[PDB]
Amino acid sequence: DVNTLTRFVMEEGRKARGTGELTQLLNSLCTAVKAISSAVRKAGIAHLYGIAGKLDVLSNDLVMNMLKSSFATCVLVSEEDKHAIIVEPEKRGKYVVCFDPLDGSSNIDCLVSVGTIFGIYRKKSTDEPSEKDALQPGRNLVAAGYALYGSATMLVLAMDCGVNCFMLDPAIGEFILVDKDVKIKKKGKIYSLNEGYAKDFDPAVTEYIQRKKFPPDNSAPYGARYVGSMVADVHRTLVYGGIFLYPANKKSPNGKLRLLYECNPMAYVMEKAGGMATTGKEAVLDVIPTDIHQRAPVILGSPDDVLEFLKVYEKHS
Amino acid sequence: DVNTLTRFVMEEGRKARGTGELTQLLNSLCTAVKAISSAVRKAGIAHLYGIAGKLDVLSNDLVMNMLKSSFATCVLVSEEDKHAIIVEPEKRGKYVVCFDPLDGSSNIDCLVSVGTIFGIYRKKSTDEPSEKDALQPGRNLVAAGYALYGSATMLVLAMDCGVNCFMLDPAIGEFILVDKDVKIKKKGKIYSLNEGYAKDFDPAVTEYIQRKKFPPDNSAPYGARYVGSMVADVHRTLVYGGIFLYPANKKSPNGKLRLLYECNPMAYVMEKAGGMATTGKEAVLDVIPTDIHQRAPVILGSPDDVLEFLKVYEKHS
Amino acid sequence: DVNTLTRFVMEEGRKARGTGELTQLLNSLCTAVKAISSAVRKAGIAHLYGIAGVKKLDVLSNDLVMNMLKSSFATCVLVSEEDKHAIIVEPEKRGKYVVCFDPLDGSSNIDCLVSVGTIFGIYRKKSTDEPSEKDALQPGRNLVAAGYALYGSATMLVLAMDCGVNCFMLDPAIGEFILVDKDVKIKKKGKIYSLNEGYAKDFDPAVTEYIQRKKFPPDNSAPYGARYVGSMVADVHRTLVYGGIFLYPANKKSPNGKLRLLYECNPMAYVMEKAGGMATTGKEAVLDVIPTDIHQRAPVILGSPDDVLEFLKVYEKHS
Amino acid sequence: DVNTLTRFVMEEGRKARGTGELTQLLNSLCTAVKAISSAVRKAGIAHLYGIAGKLDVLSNDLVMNMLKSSFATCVLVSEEDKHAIIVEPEKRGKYVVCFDPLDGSSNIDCLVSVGTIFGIYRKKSTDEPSEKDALQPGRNLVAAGYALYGSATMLVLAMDCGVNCFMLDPAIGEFILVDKDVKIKKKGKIYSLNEGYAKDFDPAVTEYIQRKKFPPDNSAPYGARYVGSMVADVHRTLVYGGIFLYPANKKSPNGKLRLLYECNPMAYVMEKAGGMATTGKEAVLDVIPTDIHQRAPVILGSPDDVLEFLKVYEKHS
Ligand SMILES: CC(C)Cc1ccc(S(=O)(=O)NC(=O)Nc2ncc(Br)s2)s1
Ligand SMILES: CC(C)Cc1ccc(S(=O)(=O)NC(=O)Nc2ncc(Br)s2)s1
Ligand SMILES: CC(C)Cc1ccc(S(=O)(=O)NC(=O)Nc2ncc(Br)s2)s1
Ligand SMILES: CC(C)Cc1ccc(S(=O)(=O)NC(=O)Nc2ncc(Br)s2)s1
Secondary structure (H helix, E strand, C coil): CCCEHHHHHHHHHHHHCCCCHHHHHHHHHHHHHHHHHHHHCCCCHHHHCCCCCCHHHHHHHHHHHHHHCCCCEEEEEECCCCCCEECCHHHEEEEEEEEEEEECHHHHHHCCCEEEEEEEEECCCCCCCCHHHHCCCHHHCCEEEEEEECCCEEEEEEECCEEEEEEEECCCCEEEEEECCCCCCCCCCEEECCHHHHHHCCHHHHHHHHHHHCCCCCCCCCEECECCCHHHHHHHHHHHCCEEEECCECCEECECEEHHHHHHHHHHHHHHCCCEEECCCCEHHHCCCCCCCCEECEEEECHHHHHHHHHHHHHCC | CCCEHHHHHHHHHHHHCCCCHHHHHHHHHHHHHHHHHHHHCCCCHHHHCCCCCCHHHHHHHHHHHHHHCCCCEEEEEECCCCCCEECCHHHEEEEEEEEEEEECHHHHHHCCCEEEEEEEEECCCCCCCCHHHHCCCHHHCCEEEEEEECCCEEEEEEECCEEEEEEEECCCCEEEEEECCCCCCCCCCEEECCHHHHHHCCHHHHHHHHHHHCCCCCCCCCEECECCCHHHHHHHHHHHCCEEEECCCCCCCCCCCEHHHHHHHHHHHHHHCCCEEECCCCEHHHCCCCCCCCECCEEEECHHHHHHHHHHHHHCC | CCCEHHHHHHHHHHHHCCCCHHHHHHHHHHHHHHHHHHHHCCCCHHHHCCCCCCCCHHHHHHHHHHHHHHCCCCEEEEEECCCCCCEECCHHHCCCEEEEEEEEECHHHHHHCCCEEEEEEEEECCCCCCCCHHHHCCCHHHCCEEEEEEECCCEEEEEEECCEEEEEEEECCCCEEEEEECCCCCCCCCCEEECCHHHHHHCCHHHHHHHHHHHCCCCCCCCCEECECCCHHHHHHHHHHHCCEEEECCCCCCCCCCCEHHHHHHHHHHHHHHCCCEEECCCCEHHHCCCCCCCCECCEEEECHHHHHHHHHHHHHCC | CCCEHHHHHHHHHHHCCCCCHHHHHHHHHHHHHHHHHHHHCCCCHHHHCCCCCCHHHHHHHHHHHHHHCCCCEEEEEECCCCCCEECCHHHEEEEEEEEEEEECHHHHHHCCCEEEEEEEEECCCCCCCCHHHHCCCHHHCCEEEEEEECCCEEEEEEECCEEEEEEEECCCCEEEEEECCCCCCCCCCEEECCHHHHHHCCHHHHHHHHHHHCCCCCCCCCEECECCCHHHHHHHHHHHCCEEEECCCCCCCCCCCEHHHHHHHHHHHHHHCCCEEECCCCEHHHCCCCCCCCECCEEEECHHHHHHHHHHHHHCC
16 A cells, blocks of 8 residues: 555554654645755746746755744754754754755756755653753653655654655655665775875774775775765665775864764664664764864674774774 | 757857758757656656566657757767668668767666767768768868756757757756857866776876876876766866876787777867877877777867877877 | 645544445546546647547547446446436445446537536445435435535546645646645625526516626626636536636526536535625525436526625515 | 657748748747646655755746747737836847746646646837737737646647647657647537626626536537636547537626737647637637737637537627
8 A cells, every 4th residue: 555754654654642742843844845946946947047037045944944934843944044943942852863955956057966864852850951862862852753855855754663765756755665664785885085195094984985895805996975065975785785884084184074974874774674883983873062063983784894994993093 | 048959050150141950950860869868867667567567779769869850960870870860762861970978878877978979961972871971080070069967957069160068957857058169178086997997098198197197296196086977077177177098008009998989079178178188199180080880099179188288198109 | 844645534434433435436537537637638639640550539438437446346336327227236245335426527619628627425335225326315415425526627526525625736747636625615795696697588587687687786796707718617616716706507498407416516515605606596495405307407507695685685686 | 740849840830941930939938848748747845845965937937938048039918017128238139929838837736737838929120129919919929828727738839830749758858740730629528617696697608607507409418527727628628519608797898818928829730630619709819919918708619619609699689
């Protein structure tokens, strides 16, 4: 029998005997994603060029407004805003949302894939809502996932019940369930990082890459892929398996990607699909943050691939 | 004034005082591109999953059927067909079209960007149409380009007048002109190739890539990008500058990419934009082919970068 | 703040403390309405004419509505204009609601691109017996929600429940029904009457007089305008938006009318009453007729209350 | 073989050895019609109702701007404009267009069908464009037709070669040919007019309608249909046969519909499909206009029905 995003969430909600507040949140976010998808594919661009005589800003406004108006949220952190946004009292609900409304949009000039990344927490302290409420470790996530605006638009939703993939059918504006309860390959054959920082790599990263190009067990070398847009690179890793790396360099001594709305959501999806995500020193989901725009190094993907890198890391003390 | 692809081609055609066959061909090609785009974005997928109780094949059928019914073609070469297709006599016109209807479609499960690549020639003899009519050197091209089905759908068209970029507005089905007479940066800061196969690199490729990462002076090392879909990587090279390599090695003395409907159309776009495209031994556009599916190595992008690669390449000759 | 159909129905459901079964039903029906809309607007018709080198629209609409309702797990008996007998939902998918619907009303003239629509009425099963066709034989008084989708110049969903009538506009760029008209009410009296005057030779004597009063008013005031699309959902929706009267009455050749009581007359009667209008057969209220056959017919006269009352006065004068 | 509007017009135009100005015109008009359809079906209305925090006017702006920028027109007459619009000198071409950009839009609150009506003339002087260029009789039309925004969107185009019907496929923004060289039924079973104004009827209109309800030859009476949107009522008459009336009476001796951009294009379509269109006294296409906004009565449809009406009309002298 056919299933949609809304219907899947309502049945999981009735199964868990919840109040419906989370369903209202997710229904609002998906409405936002459909408007973002339509703008990213350039519907109406002809009016901007005079047929009748900014995208990361628009995306941020769409997500902010649909979440506020859902009556289900209280604190909102966005890549686009210097401080956390506190929802007004008459619209407050019980959830905290960290999001990147249009990740990769700096290179959208070349029509690279871009995406929306989100992670949802229950507000945990009873204090008055503040920026501190978004500083929970990723272990605390209630739901997280992403929308990828690639050759098609897909919504990946990870919850306690697992990971599920929904394809936007733009003819009816419905997210159709196409892949149920997905799991990542135990081991893949692709590695992904920006090798232009090879001069600054720590010795452990240098060796691990060398093992991928020149395998000691004369097996086939890995192929390399690096789009430069995290949502595209992570989703390929989920669908095909392998490993994705963004380690620290001289320009970025604490790493480059953001912990709250880039690293933690992707780590949650990976673990719910049976994968891994580490900083080298610890699991990403175990890092306790102190600043909402703080950075972290990340190595994630199929479990056999992340484990092999951790052994090389251990060799270099 | 706002401009569309159909309006622009009509103006160039009336300017050159042509008969209109080339305009009919390009109009039919664009109807195919819009139908491919609609299917690539998964319109109507809900009916496939039972709401009421092939993509590379379909792309090929769309381009093939729209070209045959244009009355403007006589020989059609496609990546999908072993032999050249000869249009039935009642529908023959004067142009030869070589095309890849859905390049990158092998990895379409991960929603990577995909594309359609085409190059259009004038039939040169009055003999009866045969496969030989497609064996012209790239220098002979009348028009070439690609459609990128990325975060948005864009059509890039190169002719004698230069390179122009058109954005598909899906709300009305029109290609809107957004970048006129584009030129590539004289020197860039990005190199693009599959470094996972470094074990097999030609020694000149090894040394050249090492100089991008480890500059002998004190300039900044280049960044790395590799989507793995030719249309996406080539379009980024056009927009941002730099270099793209799919070179020859000892295991593949002729490269991997196909000359007729991958290498030549892209070489043509680059040269019309003030860039370069070499095999290492000569310009891609000067190769005279002997087989419709023959392969060729290609190194293309900003001219200062391509010239610097040839200096290292010649050092190892 | 913006509001959508799903968001609006979730709030009324949370407010009334329901289990969610009705919300799943309506959300499933709304998905079916978007797929019908997409097909009615001829998306993909290029493929039927050979661009790369199937079913009738009323069959496909029936298949879409039937399939989404079954898969909602919210229904047990389904009556459709297209099926001779009531459909009894299999046990593993049964819920507590009975739905009577016309999946594509007016579709016989869809060759001229006239407006077409989907009509629906939803009941709660009343007996504890095993579900059967009898469960669909309730009077209109018992309806829980009813409405229609009009596939016109735009696609709109009109939903009537106890809280009133609300109008939602389909935004095809994102596939959402956007709330655009809240708590709608019909004018007390209008300026348009709607019926097929081509069959006047067979008119009841009372229908002849009332129409005569509309064209040639005894107090030489201004005549009414006449409009008749011939598609019930379009004529009834115009009656709601502009006011006036719609007639499909009984005569000597057809003493019971022509329109179907369960899935045409009753749902339109319910919408009208919730918006402050009237709907009669001439002898009794549409919503009070007790049916004996799921495909039985009934005459209908509906619209603005002053207009329907003036008709009843003429009908009674002719005994 | 599949055919589209732009491909069909180019083929007829090359067949006639024309310069391409009319094709550039009709292609530009077809871009405006697709933009009007998109707005009429309410695409993007969510942004109007605040998701991120006029229609007849937009239609006139779309048609005016696409026609001006086509370089194919010099004078434009619109239902929305008091005086003719004169195209500025650098954009002038040789054609005159009379149009109603959104007919029936006064009742768009109830979502009744609406449409666009157009008629195209070659201009008259070689001097300078002026209003007089739009004052030609319907016999002079080069092409005319309408777009119906009903349950689907259809463009009906009549030229010298006949009447052809194109269905807009919104998934690709292309007009598909679906009914070729259409001809009307010789006699129908439906009459169409506003009977609420019967108190004002001409005696012949009264007698003719009486014959439809109470036939003297005891045959079956006709049915009645009246949408109130001329494009919808006229299109039903073409597809099903019958008669459509908006006749003269004492209060409106010249009718209500507009001659230049409502009566003439529909009269042309009817005659090209083998039907008739009269004022009662003469053929609509033979009226010579003196004012761009002058009115005329119209009776059109199947020939046996119009002849039967004229017989009653002639009996009353
Ligand atoms: C954690 C995941 C497996 C999904 C979820 C768990 C809880 C929720 S919820 O708290 O939002 N509850 C509801 O939505 N209840 C409803 N009642 C009627 C309807 Br119709 S849905 S979603
Ligand atoms: C190669 C570039 C300079 C562009 C082109 C050159 C030639 C053509 S063409 O041969 O196709 N000619 C036409 O299209 N003529 C037309 N006449 C009326 C219309 Br309306 S279009 S396009
Ligand atoms: C009074 C009528 C106009 C509206 C209704 C009455 C009953 C229903 S219902 O049975 O469908 N209940 C729910 O849906 N509850 C929900 N819980 C969580 C979510 Br989220 S919605 S709607
Ligand atoms: C009268 C109707 C039956 C159709 C028409 C007749 C003439 C025209 S025309 O003046 O527009 N000529 C062209 O369009 N020529 C072209 N050459 C190349 C291209 Br490609 S189109 S349309």
